[PDB]
């Protein structure tokens with residue numbers, strides 16, 4: 518039933534644009550919507566990746582490796598899965614491993630890679646691949662992991678035990694007052710609910 | 712260490728605006744960011760999303776999801792039931808109300824998250840994730856009545872919780888839908904648990 522009729526540019530920045538979307542509703546009636554898109558999407562299957570990095574270490578409980586960064590849109594610090602945009606020509610897997618190493622120091626191994634999933638589909642067309650990666654924390658490469666953030670990138674690494682993730686996130690929100698990302702929180706809830 | 716200096720309006724629609732944010736990077740260098748905000752926020756958060764756990768005896772526990780055309784995406788998405796919190800509504804009440812409108816189910820609050828970010832590199836949008844159980848054996852949930860608000864068109868999809876990730880992959884494969892990143896994240900953690 519439903520489909521896009523037209524997409525009219527309202528305002529284009531260097532990184533984000535706002536569009537007026539005209540579409541057909543399922544009664545046969547024309548309607549509009551205000552849509553956000555990035556200006557950076559080329560032929561990638563998605564804008565970005567987010568990495569679920571499972572740090573595995575003999576005689577350690579598995580940890581989820583998370584990052585803490587100031588996010589200007591939020592006016593504050595956020596706790597998130599390591600993530601970044603996919604470069605032109607780059608694979609989601611390569612972007613995930615590259616971003617994980619830049620943001621955390623760790624060298625991971627691919628486990629799985631999602632289809633493109635929507636970030637906030639009532640608002641934007643933004644999508645990511647969610648890439649699950651295992652980190653062998655017994656490898657010497659992963660012993661003293663040094664973040665290599667790019668220009669204007671400033672990231673803190675936070676590893677939390679998988680078996681207590683939701684309580685440990687609740688403890689950081691109690692004591693350091695930041696925001697947890699919705700995907701991180703969703704993953705932690707499901708670890709509890711399973 | 713980092714903080715907002717100023718915000719400059721770039722473009723304001725009825726529902727969404729685009730701002731250019733000036734901020735202090737942790738070197739003491741001044742930097743800019745293009746950020747999106749909703750115009751609708753009052754609230755604890757812009758919105759709620761509901762994790763609806765449908766419990767019927769002698770059946771697999773299901774997660775209740777919705778499929779809707781999303782104009783920013785140009786296609787159909789599979790999502791947790793969700794909407795904006797009314798001015799003076801609690802997150803819990805917004806959850807039960809949104810769940811009833813989009814699915815017809817009448818549910819009970821299990822737990823409620825703090826405000827979590829949707830896409831903090833792009834927007835300031837936040838939600839409360841609200842876990843809700845639905846007693847599927849109750850007469851009120853026998854022939855559930857979906858009450859769409861104006862211009863909502865929602866298909867309900869219930870999927871077994873114990874095979875959720877495989878079921879979502881199947882749907883994407885067969886039906887050319889986009890799964891929401893929070894839904895996919897929850898589904899991953901169900902599999903990754905122990």
Ligand SMILES: C[C@H]1CCO[C@@H]1C(=O)Nc1cnns1
Pocket residue numbers: 549550551552726795
């Ligand atoms: C918040 C939604 C829920 C349904 O009605 C509202 C709506 O029209 N939002 C729009 C955003 N952009 N253009 S219209």
Ligand SMILES: C[C@H]1CCO[C@@H]1C(=O)Nc1cnns1
Pocket residue numbers: 532557601602743744745746
């Ligand atoms: C797309 C992001 C992720 C990598 O760095 C990019 C960036 O600087 N974005 C900005 C948005 N507004 N001002 S700068």
Ligand SMILES: [Cl-]
Pocket residue numbers: 710764821842844
């Ligand atoms: Cl539950």
Ligand SMILES: [Mg+2]
Pocket residue numbers: 599600601620
């Ligand atoms: Mg990043």
Ligand SMILES: [Mg+2]
Pocket residue numbers: 600601616619620670
């Ligand atoms: Mg990066």
Ligand SMILES: [Mg+2]
Pocket residue numbers: 792793794813
């Ligand atoms: Mg909704």
Ligand SMILES: [Mg+2]
Pocket residue numbers: 793794809812813859860863
């Ligand atoms: Mg609704």
